Amino acid sequence: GPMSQVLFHQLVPLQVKCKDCEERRVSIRMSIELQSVSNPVHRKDLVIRLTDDTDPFFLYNLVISEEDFQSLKFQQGLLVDFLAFPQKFIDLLQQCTQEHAKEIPRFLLQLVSPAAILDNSPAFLNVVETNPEKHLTHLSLKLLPGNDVEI
């Protein structure tokens, strides 16, 4: 079976945005794990998971294999390789967390759905930086509803 190493696990403030409504959820438990298998073949995956301590139905995840990361790096225009990606993402999440109490946060973590409702469609986890001139999106990840593993 795959063994997991937790690289990040904490409550994060999340702005959930649907077509006609936006809600701030403060009890979102976000984790980043490195999962590995050694036999018969050595393989590493990065798993990103969002759960909600106060809502058992809210679940999103993304599994990124070390071989699938080169596509994501290109799609997102990233400068980091697979092994450097967790620390880049964690540093952004720490900046989001440090701005949790601000009325106008400099860094925001948001989950955006193009639908009017949260459903079985993917939603986009964005890290946005705010400033007087314009908003910058540092990262967008397409998360799937549900958990990475059954139940």
Swiss-Prot record:
Span of domain PISA: 41-93
Localisation: Cytoplasm, Cytoskeleton, Microtubule organizing center, Centrosome; Cytoplasm, Cytoskeleton, Microtubule organizing center, Centrosome, Centriole
The record's account of how the chain is modified after translation: Ubiquitinated by the SCF(FBXW5) E3 ubiquitin-protein ligase complex during S phase, leading to its degradation and preventing centriole reduplication. Ubiquitinated by the anaphase promoting complex/cyclosome (APC/C) E3 ubiquitin-protein ligase complex, leading to its degradation and preventing centriole reduplication.
Domain of life: Eukaryota
Comment block on domains: The 35 nM long coiled-coil domain mediates homodimerization while the globular N-terminus links the dimers at an angle of 40 degrees to form the inner ring.
Noted disease: Microcephaly 14, primary, autosomal recessive: A form of microcephaly, a disease defined as a head circumference more than 3 standard deviations below the age, sex and ethnically matched mean. Brain weight is markedly reduced and the cerebral cortex is disproportionately small.
Complex and partners: Nine homodimers form a cartwheel structure with an internal diameter of 23 nm and radial spokes connecting to the microtubule triplets. Forms a complex with CPAP and STIL. Interacts with FBXW5. Interacts with NUP62 and TUBG1 at the centrosome. Interacts with CENATAC; the interaction increases with CENATAC acetylation. Interacts with FZR1; the interaction is regulated by CENATAC and leads to SASS6 proteasomal degradation.
Summary of the function given for this chain in its UniProt record: Central scaffolding component of the centrioles ensuring their 9-fold symmetry. Required for centrosome biogenesis and duplication: required both for mother-centriole-dependent centriole duplication and deuterosome-dependent centriole amplification in multiciliated cells. Not required for centriole formation in embryonic stem cells but necessary to maintain centriole architecture. Required for the recruitment of STIL to the procentriole and for STIL-mediated centriole amplification. Overexpression results in excess foci-bearing centriolar markers.
Protein's UniProt name: Spindle assembly abnormal protein 6 homolog
Native source species: Homo sapiens (Human)
Gene that encodes the chain: SASS6
